[PDB]
Amino acid sequence: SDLIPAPPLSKVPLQQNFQDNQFQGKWYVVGLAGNAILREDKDPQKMYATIYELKEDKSYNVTSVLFRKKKCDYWIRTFVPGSQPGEFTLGNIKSYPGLTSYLVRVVSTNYNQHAMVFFKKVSQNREYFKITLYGRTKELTSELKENFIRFSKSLGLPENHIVFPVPIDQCID
Numbered sequence: 001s002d003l004i005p006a007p008p009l010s011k012v013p014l015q016q017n018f019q020d021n022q023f024q025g026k027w028y029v030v031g032l033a034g035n036a037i038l039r040e041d042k043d044p045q046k047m048y049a050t051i052y053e054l055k056e057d058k059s060y061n062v063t064s065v066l067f068r069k070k071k072c073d074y075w076i077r078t079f080v081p082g083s084q085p086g087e088f089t090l091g092n093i094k095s096y097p098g099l100t101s102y103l104v105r106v107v108s109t110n111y112n113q114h115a116m117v118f119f120k121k122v123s124q125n126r127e128y129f130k131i132t133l134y135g136r137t138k139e140l141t142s143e144l145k146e147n148f149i150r151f152s153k154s155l156g157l158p159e160n161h162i163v164f165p166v167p168i169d170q171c172i173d
């Protein structure tokens with residue numbers, strides 16, 4: 001396993017004043033980048049969606065829905081608030097074999113249109129990270145998408161580690 005290193009959190013911006021309620025709801029993953037993410041033009045990534053529903057006690061209840069093998073699989077987990085508004089950590093961490101650490105950080109969002117969230121995961125002792133271009137709709141402006149490509153590069157990811165999942169209608173509507 002050769003892997004680009006996770007950047008210093010120092011160079012991963014936080015969205016200052018973070019409104020945890022205005023971020024609730026469905027988000028379409030219009031952009032996906034990471035040191036373990038790789039463009040594959042034979043079988044391009046199908047677009048998927050993540051639903052953030054706020055508990056209860058303010059931890060998010062994060063359900064991801066994605067269309068795989070002619071069905072909808074539901075990846076479900078909890079984000080517990082961390083250091084500061086916009087930062088979270090994975091809840092019930094012991095459920096996941098090999099998993100030592102998981103860190104969520106909301107880089108930027110205007111809540112009703114778009115969002116960039118940074119994730120950093122240490123699993124089986126290897127250190128992964130990814131960035132997510134969240135769209136409230138399935139398509140986004142070139143401005144936002146290129147701005148995301150720039151940020152993804154600012155953290156050492158080359159263009160072939162940056163994908164834009166192709167929109168689908170299965171499971172995600």
Ligand SMILES: O=C(NCCN(CCNC(=O)c1cccc(O)c1O)CCNC(=O)c1cccc(=O)n1O)c1cccc(O)c1O
Pocket residue numbers: 034036037064066075077096099119120121123128129130
């Ligand atoms: O279940 C999923 N498949 C993960 C397959 N995978 C790709 C590489 N990951 C990555 O590149 C990656 C990098 C940073 C953060 C992530 O969540 C990542 O999946 C690695 C599998 N990951 C796990 O075992 C895992 C166990 C427990 C929580 C968790 O989130 N993950 O992923 C999955 C689906 C939708 C969104 C996710 O975020 C997922 O994780």
Ligand SMILES: [Cl-]
Pocket residue numbers: none
């Ligand atoms: Cl993924």
Ligand SMILES: [Fe+3]
Pocket residue numbers: none
């Ligand atoms: Fe994950």
Ligand code: NA
Pocket residue numbers: 125126127
């Ligand atoms: Na390590």
Ligand code: NA
Pocket residue numbers: 065171172173
């Ligand atoms: Na749904």
